[PDB]
From a paper:
Class I ribonucleotide reductases (RNRs) convert ribonucleotides into deoxyribonucleotides under oxic conditions. The R2 subunit provides a radical required for catalysis conducted by the R1 subunit. The discovery of a metal-free R2 defined the new RNR subclass Ie. In R2e, three of the otherwise strictly conserved metal-binding glutamates in the active site are substituted.
Author numbering:
A (entry chain A): 7 to 332
B (entry chain C): 8 to 332
C-alpha cells in the first residue's frame, strides 16, 4: 500500500484516548477478541478469561487435549525395525508413500487449516483450543518423519517426498481442502476441517492398522493410535462448533451448507477412490479400505449433525481392523 | 463467480491424474500449504524433518518442546497466605497488571505468532510458530490460573473491565495488532520480537519485585517458566528477521531500521503512560523503566540492531536481577 514504509500502520486509525474506566456492560459486549481486530479497527480488544467459560464443552475439550499431549520420541519405534525388514519392498514403499501423503494433510491443517478457524471462532476459549490442535497436528506431521528416520534410508525418504509432490491426485485432494479455507464463510472452513480430521487420512491409517492386525509394525501402531486419539476429538470438536454456528444461520444458508457439504464429501470421496485405489490395487485388502473410508465418512457427517450417507452394507469393516483401532 | 454450494477449487484448473517422481525443478517450485493462497495451481509439499534447511530450526524446536509446562503443575495455592499479606493496592495492581499481560499474550497466541507462518523462510520454522502460539495460549491461560487460585469473582470481573476500559492499554495492543497486518513480513517479525522481548516486562517487573521481597514465591516460579519461553521466542523472531533482512535492498534496510525505532519509541512512550499510571502508588517507579529500557536493548539486539539505551539508563537493581534466575 501507499503508506510511507517508516510509518506505523496504526497511524491510519483514530487513536484511543487517555481515559480509564471500568467498562460497563455495553462496552464489554462490544469488545472483541484480538483475532477479530483486522476488520474492526477502533474496537476494544479483550483478553481471554478462563474464569468466564461461555461453553462448558470448551473447558472439557481443552483439558482433554492437553492431558493427551505426547511426543513421537517416547514411542520405541526402533523396535519395529525387524518387522519392517520382514515386509516386502512393495509394502515398505507403499507405507512410506502413504505416510508422506498423510504428512501433507497434517502439514496443511497445522499451518493454515486449523489456524484459519480462529478468527471466526464462537468463543475465545475455542480460539486457544485451535492453537493446541494446530500444534498437535504439527506433532502428527513430525511423527511420520520420526518413523522415516527410524526405518528408512535417505534415498527412500527422498523418493517418497518426490512421489507426493508429483502425485496429481494427492495435489487435487490437498488443494480442494486448502481452497475452502479461503472462504469467507467460517462454516465452510469448519466443514473442511471436520472432513480433514474425521475422514481424509483414514484410508491411510488403514495400512498400519492392517499391519498390526497381522502382528507387524506393532510399536508404529501405538503411535498411530495416539494420532487417532487426537483426531477423533479434533473432528468431533470441529463438527460440534459447526453445529453451534449452523443453528444461528438462516434457512437459506442452512440449505446451501447442506448441499455444499454433500458436494465436498462426494468430490473428496471420488478423489480417495482414485488416490488410494491406485496405491492399494496390488493388495487383497483393497475393498475393505473403502468400507473403512465410507465408515469414517459417516462419522464425519455425524460429527456435523447430518445423517449417514452409506449403508451398513457399505461400511462393514473387518473385525480385525476394528480390533486394531484399540 | 461461484454458486454458494460449489467448491472454491472448481474456479481453478484441476490437477490431472498423472503420477511422477518429481524431478529437481518440480521440487524447487513446490510450496508450503500456507503459501498456496498466493499460488493456486502450484504443488504443495509436506514438511520433511529429515531435510533440515537451517539447523537452528531443529535446535529451537527441540528446546521449546522439551520446555513444555502447564500451570497446573505449579503449586500456586501455596501463595495464598503471601497474597493475603499484601496490601489492597498490591492485590488490585497485580490483577490489573496480569490482565494486561493476558491481553498481549492472547493477541500473540491467536494472530500475532500465527501471521508469521505464511512468509516463514522454512517449513520447520512454520511448525515452530504453531508450538509458540500454543505456548502463548498457555502463558495467557496461566494468568487466569493465578486468578482462579487467589482472587474473588468480583476482583476478576473488575480487572477484565478495567482492561477493556483502559484507553492506553487499547492503544498498545492495537498498535501491535496493526503491524501484524503489514504487507511486509519483516514488519510482522519486528512486532513479534518487540512483544516477546519488551512489551510485557514492565508487567513482569511486579512479580519479580514480590519475589525479591520474599512474597508470591510460587507465582514467581511460573513467571520464570513464561520468561524461559519468551526469551527463546524473541531470540527466534529476531534471528529470522535478520535472515530475511540480509536479502533486502539497502533502501529497505534503512526504512526497516527507521520503522523499528519508530515502533520502539511509540511503544516506549505508551509504556510510560500505561505502567507509569499503574505503578504511581509504588516507590519502584524509576526502577521499572530502567528494567523496560534494559529489555528494549535486548529486543533491539535480538533484531541485530545496536543498543539504544545507555548503561546509566538500564541500571536494574540487583535484587530484581537475582529474582530473574
Amino acid at each position: 500500500t501507499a503508506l510511507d514504509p517508516t510509518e506505523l500502520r496504526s497511524s491510519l486509525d483514530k487513536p484511543f484516548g487517555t481515559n480509564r474506566v471500568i467498562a460497563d456492560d455495553a462496552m464489554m459486549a462490544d469488545s472483541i477478541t484480538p483475532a477479530q481486530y483486522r476488520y474492526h479497527h477502533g474496537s476494544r480488544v479483550r483478553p481471554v478469561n478462563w474464569n468466564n467459560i461461555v461453553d462448558d464443552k470448551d473447558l472439557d475439550v481443552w483439558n482433554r487435549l492437553i492431558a493427551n499431549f505426547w511426543l513421537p520420541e517416547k514411542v520405541p519405534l526402533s523396535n519395529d525395525i525387524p518387522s519392517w525388514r520382514s515386509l516386502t519392498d512393495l509394502e515398505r514403499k507403499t507405507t512410506t508413500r502413504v505416510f508422506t501423503g498423510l504428512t501433507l494433510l497434517d502439514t496443511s491443517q497445522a499451518t493454515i487449516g486449523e489456524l484459519c478457524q480462529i478468527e471466526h471462532a464462537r468463543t475465545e476459549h475455542e480460539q486457544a483450543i485451535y492453537t493446541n490442535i494446530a500444534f498437535m497436528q504439527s506433532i502428527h506431521a513430525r511423527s511420520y518423519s520420526s518413523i522415516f528416520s527410524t526405518l528408512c534410508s535417505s534415498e527412500e525418504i527422498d523418493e517418497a517426498y518426490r512421489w507426493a509432490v508429483g502425485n496429481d491426485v494427492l495435489q487435487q485432494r490437498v488443494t480442494t481442502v486448502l481452497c475452502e479455507y479461503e472462504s469467507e464463510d467460517p462454516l465452510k472452513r469448519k466443514i473442511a476441517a471436520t472432513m480433514l480430521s474425521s475422514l481424509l487420512l483414514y484410508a491411510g491409517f488403514y495400512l498400519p492398522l492392517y499391519f498390526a492386525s497381522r502382528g507387524k509394525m506393532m510399536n508404529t501402531a501405538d503411535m498411530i493410535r495416539l494420532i487417532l486419539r487426537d483426531k477423533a476429538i479434533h473432528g468431533y470438536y470441529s463438527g460440534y462448533k459447526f453445529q453451534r454456528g449452523l443453528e444461528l444461520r438462516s434457512e437459506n444458508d442452512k440449505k446451501n451448507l447442506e448441499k455444499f457439504t454433500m458436494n465436498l464429501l462426494d468430490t473428496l470421496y471420488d478423489l480417495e477412490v482414485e488416490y488410494s485405489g491406485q496405491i492399494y490395487e496390488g493388495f487383497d485388502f483393497h475393498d475393505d479400505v473403502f468400507d473403512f473410508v465410507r465408515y469414517n465418512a459417516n462419522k464425519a457427517l455425524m460429527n456435523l449433525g447430518y445423517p449417514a450417507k452409506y449403508s451398513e452394507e457399505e461400511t462393514h469393516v473387518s473385525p480385525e481392523i476394528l480390533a486394531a483401532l484399540s
